[PDB]
Design a protein around this motif. Structure first.
Motif, PDB file in Angstrom:
ATOM      1  N   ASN A 289      36.795  51.570  18.544  1.00  0.00           N
ATOM      2  CA  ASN A 289      37.365  51.313  19.862  1.00  0.00           C
ATOM      3  C   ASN A 289      36.649  52.101  20.954  1.00  0.00           C
ATOM      4  OD1 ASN A 289      39.762  49.724  18.754  1.00  0.00           O
ATOM      5  ND2 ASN A 289      40.100  51.726  17.796  1.00  0.00           N
ATOM      6  N   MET A 290      36.340  51.431  22.060  1.00  0.00           N
ATOM      7  CA  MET A 290      35.618  52.062  23.160  1.00  0.00           C
ATOM      8  C   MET A 290      36.228  51.718  24.519  1.00  0.00           C
ATOM      9  SD  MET A 290      31.773  51.298  24.541  1.00  0.00           S
ATOM     10  CE  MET A 290      30.961  51.588  22.970  1.00  0.00           C
ATOM     11  N   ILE A 291      36.297  52.712  25.398  1.00  0.00           N
ATOM     12  CA  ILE A 291      36.737  52.502  26.773  1.00  0.00           C
ATOM     13  C   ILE A 291      35.634  52.928  27.739  1.00  0.00           C
ATOM     14  CG2 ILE A 291      38.450  53.071  28.536  1.00  0.00           C
ATOM     15  CD1 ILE A 291      40.492  53.531  26.462  1.00  0.00           C
ATOM     16  N   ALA A 292      35.340  52.083  28.722  1.00  0.00           N
ATOM     17  CA  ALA A 292      34.320  52.402  29.716  1.00  0.00           C
ATOM     18  C   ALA A 292      34.887  52.352  31.132  1.00  0.00           C
ATOM     19  CB  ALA A 292      33.139  51.451  29.584  1.00  0.00           C
ATOM     20  N   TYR A 293      34.448  53.279  31.978  1.00  0.00           N
ATOM     21  CA  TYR A 293      34.877  53.296  33.371  1.00  0.00           C
ATOM     22  C   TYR A 293      33.717  53.009  34.316  1.00  0.00           C
ATOM     23  CZ  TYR A 293      36.776  54.860  37.836  1.00  0.00           C
ATOM     24  OH  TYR A 293      37.176  54.930  39.152  1.00  0.00           O
ATOM     25  N   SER A 294      34.003  52.258  35.374  1.00  0.00           N
ATOM     26  CA  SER A 294      33.016  51.982  36.407  1.00  0.00           C
ATOM     27  C   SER A 294      33.488  52.536  37.744  1.00  0.00           C
ATOM     28  CB  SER A 294      32.753  50.481  36.521  1.00  0.00           C
ATOM     29  OG  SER A 294      31.884  50.200  37.605  1.00  0.00           O
ATOM     30  N   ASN A 295      32.712  53.448  38.317  1.00  0.00           N
ATOM     31  CA  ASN A 295      33.039  54.019  39.618  1.00  0.00           C
ATOM     32  C   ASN A 295      32.957  52.982  40.731  1.00  0.00           C
ATOM     33  OD1 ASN A 295      33.791  56.849  39.516  1.00  0.00           O
ATOM     34  ND2 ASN A 295      31.732  57.253  38.719  1.00  0.00           N
ATOM     35  N   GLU A 296      32.086  51.996  40.546  1.00  0.00           N
ATOM     36  CA  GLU A 296      31.806  50.947  41.521  1.00  0.00           C
ATOM     37  C   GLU A 296      33.000  50.022  41.732  1.00  0.00           C
ATOM     38  OE1 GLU A 296      28.278  50.004  42.512  1.00  0.00           O
ATOM     39  OE2 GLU A 296      28.708  48.090  43.497  1.00  0.00           O
ATOM     40  N   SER A 297      33.716  49.767  40.642  1.00  0.00           N
ATOM     41  CA  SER A 297      34.824  48.820  40.674  1.00  0.00           C
ATOM     42  C   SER A 297      36.154  49.462  40.290  1.00  0.00           C
ATOM     43  CB  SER A 297      34.533  47.635  39.751  1.00  0.00           C
ATOM     44  OG  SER A 297      34.324  48.065  38.417  1.00  0.00           O
ATOM     45  N   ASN A 298      36.138  50.775  40.066  1.00  0.00           N
ATOM     46  CA  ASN A 298      37.333  51.525  39.670  1.00  0.00           C
ATOM     47  C   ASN A 298      38.113  50.840  38.556  1.00  0.00           C
ATOM     48  OD1 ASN A 298      37.749  51.485  43.197  1.00  0.00           O
ATOM     49  ND2 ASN A 298      36.519  52.973  42.047  1.00  0.00           N
ATOM     50  N   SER A 299      37.398  50.369  37.540  1.00  0.00           N
ATOM     51  CA  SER A 299      38.019  49.596  36.474  1.00  0.00           C
ATOM     52  C   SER A 299      37.721  50.168  35.090  1.00  0.00           C
ATOM     53  CB  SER A 299      37.557  48.138  36.543  1.00  0.00           C
ATOM     54  OG  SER A 299      38.427  47.291  35.812  1.00  0.00           O
ATOM     55  N   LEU A 300      38.711  50.096  34.206  1.00  0.00           N
ATOM     56  CA  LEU A 300      38.527  50.474  32.810  1.00  0.00           C
ATOM     57  C   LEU A 300      38.290  49.231  31.962  1.00  0.00           C
ATOM     58  CD1 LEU A 300      41.321  53.191  32.356  1.00  0.00           C
ATOM     59  CD2 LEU A 300      38.855  53.578  32.496  1.00  0.00           C
ATOM     60  N   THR A 301      37.249  49.267  31.138  1.00  0.00           N
ATOM     61  CA  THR A 301      36.933  48.142  30.266  1.00  0.00           C
ATOM     62  C   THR A 301      37.060  48.545  28.798  1.00  0.00           C
ATOM     63  OG1 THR A 301      35.403  47.224  31.913  1.00  0.00           O
ATOM     64  CG2 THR A 301      35.234  46.391  29.664  1.00  0.00           C
ATOM     65  N   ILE A 302      37.669  47.673  28.002  1.00  0.00           N
ATOM     66  CA  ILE A 302      37.895  47.947  26.588  1.00  0.00           C
ATOM     67  C   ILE A 302      36.984  47.112  25.694  1.00  0.00           C
ATOM     68  CG2 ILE A 302      39.582  47.991  24.724  1.00  0.00           C
ATOM     69  CD1 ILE A 302      41.759  48.251  26.809  1.00  0.00           C
ATOM     70  N   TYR A 303      36.251  47.788  24.817  1.00  0.00           N
ATOM     71  CA  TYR A 303      35.387  47.116  23.855  1.00  0.00           C
ATOM     72  C   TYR A 303      35.879  47.360  22.433  1.00  0.00           C
ATOM     73  CZ  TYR A 303      32.216  46.832  27.853  1.00  0.00           C
ATOM     74  OH  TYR A 303      31.665  46.591  29.089  1.00  0.00           O
ATOM     75  N   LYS A 304      35.608  46.404  21.552  1.00  0.00           N
ATOM     76  CA  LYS A 304      36.024  46.489  20.158  1.00  0.00           C
ATOM     77  C   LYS A 304      34.864  46.125  19.240  1.00  0.00           C
ATOM     78  CE  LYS A 304      38.873  46.481  16.531  1.00  0.00           C
ATOM     79  NZ  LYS A 304      37.810  46.429  15.490  1.00  0.00           N
ATOM     80  N   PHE A 305      34.645  46.927  18.203  1.00  0.00           N
ATOM     81  CA  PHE A 305      33.586  46.630  17.249  1.00  0.00           C
ATOM     82  C   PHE A 305      34.078  45.649  16.191  1.00  0.00           C
ATOM     83  CE2 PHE A 305      31.197  47.376  13.337  1.00  0.00           C
ATOM     84  CZ  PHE A 305      29.905  47.196  13.789  1.00  0.00           C
ATOM     85  N   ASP A 306      33.326  44.569  16.004  1.00  0.00           N
ATOM     86  CA  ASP A 306      33.681  43.531  15.044  1.00  0.00           C
ATOM     87  C   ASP A 306      32.865  43.709  13.764  1.00  0.00           C
ATOM     88  OD1 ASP A 306      34.081  41.140  13.565  1.00  0.00           O
ATOM     89  OD2 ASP A 306      34.401  39.978  15.394  1.00  0.00           O
ATOM     90  N   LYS A 307      33.553  44.035  12.673  1.00  0.00           N
ATOM     91  CA  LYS A 307      32.904  44.259  11.384  1.00  0.00           C
ATOM     92  C   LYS A 307      32.132  43.032  10.894  1.00  0.00           C
ATOM     93  CE  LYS A 307      37.200  43.104   8.968  1.00  0.00           C
ATOM     94  NZ  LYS A 307      37.938  43.229   7.681  1.00  0.00           N
ATOM     95  N   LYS A 308      32.649  41.845  11.205  1.00  0.00           N
ATOM     96  CA  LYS A 308      32.072  40.556  10.824  1.00  0.00           C
ATOM     97  C   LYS A 308      30.709  40.340  11.483  1.00  0.00           C
ATOM     98  CE  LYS A 308      32.950  35.606  11.809  1.00  0.00           C
ATOM     99  NZ  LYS A 308      34.059  34.737  12.297  1.00  0.00           N
ATOM    100  N   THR A 309      30.711  40.415  12.810  1.00  0.00           N
ATOM    101  CA  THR A 309      29.516  40.101  13.590  1.00  0.00           C
ATOM    102  C   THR A 309      28.612  41.318  13.780  1.00  0.00           C
ATOM    103  OG1 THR A 309      30.584  40.537  15.727  1.00  0.00           O
ATOM    104  CG2 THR A 309      30.761  38.302  14.836  1.00  0.00           C
ATOM    105  N   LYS A 310      29.156  42.498  13.493  1.00  0.00           N
ATOM    106  CA  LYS A 310      28.436  43.769  13.602  1.00  0.00           C
ATOM    107  C   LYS A 310      27.990  44.102  15.026  1.00  0.00           C
ATOM    108  CE  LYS A 310      25.661  45.050  10.218  1.00  0.00           C
ATOM    109  NZ  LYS A 310      24.283  44.980   9.661  1.00  0.00           N
TER     110      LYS A 310
END
Length: 354
Positions: A289-310
């Motif tokens: 699980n990963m969370i990223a922040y952008s100062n430009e858009s003041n937004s938090l983005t959530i990423y997920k690692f997929d074991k299937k697709t790698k």
């Protein structure tokens, strides 16, 4: 002490490690779709004080991760600790040193022990619960100690330290007793370190690509160097016990510890977007699980690692919008996922909920 020879100590380390090697092998709960957010706390802190997150095995056989921020004012240390949204507390403990000098490194140990490293390789151990000084310790090494940690389950009579040229030793909490397992090299020049779940492997690294893994149970065995091209900002041993995750400025490299040194678990991932730039991010200790922040858009983005697709893919169902942050940490106990957004001298704690 309790261990009279290094040979006796090494056998106690291996034994204790084997006691817990089969535990903590269940998965942390999967993250839900996060749609809401709440700004919980805005505080100042001393960024120059490095604090290593404390790991605890829980009753559900996975690990809790405590993250800590320290603010140092007038002979007092102000701590803010949490492992999730509902465990946020602020503790004030006295600063044992003269003139309100800041520690260079703060780490925790079992039984409410607080490890304070001051420049000149001088260590003070406090009981954070009783506010007493337990130890005043000096480590005889010409080189600066850049790692200090106490495992919560394995070999709990000692804590670990390492200097910036690869000297690695164990230090008894209660006795004037210590053992060196690796001695100073020198190509190297380390800035930090991280310990593996089973407390036998220690990774020492620096921002400019250097990554060396040492085996703590077999003295002076040659360390393994892992090929990183790139700007390292953190190395993590994932809780599954065989991923070594290398967080770089705009790339994520993950090594598979089960194979030949250098073998990747999956293709190297590029952080979108660096702009690049001030986007910051952090991966949890599951490495999925990963969370990223952008100062430009003041937004938090959530990423997920997929074991299937790698590979990592953005979760589009998480529109999290909110102050210029340069770094961040993530916690996720069963009390809720929280993101700690940091500037170079303050932080905001953000609770994320479905």
């Amino acid at each position: 002490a309790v261990a009279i020879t290094r040979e006796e100590f090494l056998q106690g380390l291996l034994q204790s490690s084997r006691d817990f090697v089969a535990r903590g092998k269940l998965k942390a709960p999967k993250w839900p779709i996060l749609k809401n957010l709440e700004l919980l706390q805005a505080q100042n802190y001393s960024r120059n004080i490095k604090t290593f997150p404390y790991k605890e095995l829980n009753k559900s056989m996975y690990y809790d991760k405590w993250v800590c921020m320290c603010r140092c004012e007038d002979g007092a240390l102000h701590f803010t600790q949490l492992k999730d949204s509902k465990t946020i507390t602020t503790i004030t403990t006295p600063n044992p040193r003269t003139g309100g000098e800041h520690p260079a490194i703060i780490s925790r140990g079992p039984c409410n022990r607080l490890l304070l490293l001051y420049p000149g390789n001088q260590i003070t151990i406090l009981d954070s619960k009783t506010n007493k000084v337990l130890r005043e310790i000096e480590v005889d090494s010409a080189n600066e100690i850049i790692y200090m940690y106490g495992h919560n389950e394995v070999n709990t009579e000692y804590f670990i330290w390492a200097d910036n040229r690869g000297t690695i030793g164990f230090q008894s909490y209660e006795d004037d007793s210590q053992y060196i397992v690796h001695s100073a090299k020198s190509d190297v020049e380390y800035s930090s370190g991280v310990l593996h779940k089973d407390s036998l492997l220690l990774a020492l690294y620096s921002p400019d690509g250097i990554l060396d893994v040492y085996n703590l149970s077999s003295p002076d065995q040659a360390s393994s160097r892992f090929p990183v091209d790139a700007k390292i900002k953190e190395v993590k041993f994932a809780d599954n016990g065989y991923w070594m995750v290398v967080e770089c400025d705009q790339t994520v490299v993950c090594f598979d510890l089960r194979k030949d040194v250098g073998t990747l678990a999956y293709p190297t991932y590029t952080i979108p977007e660096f702009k690049t730039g001030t986007v910051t991010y952090d991966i949890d200790d599951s490495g999925k699980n990963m969370i990223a922040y952008s100062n430009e858009s003041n937004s938090l983005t959530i990423y997920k690692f997929d074991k299937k697709t790698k590979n990592w893919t953005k979760d589009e169902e998480s529109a999290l919008c909110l102050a210029d942050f340069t770094d961040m940490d993530v916690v996720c106990g069963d009390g809720g996922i929280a993101a700690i957004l940091k500037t170079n001298d303050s932080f905001n704690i953000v609770a994320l909920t479905p």
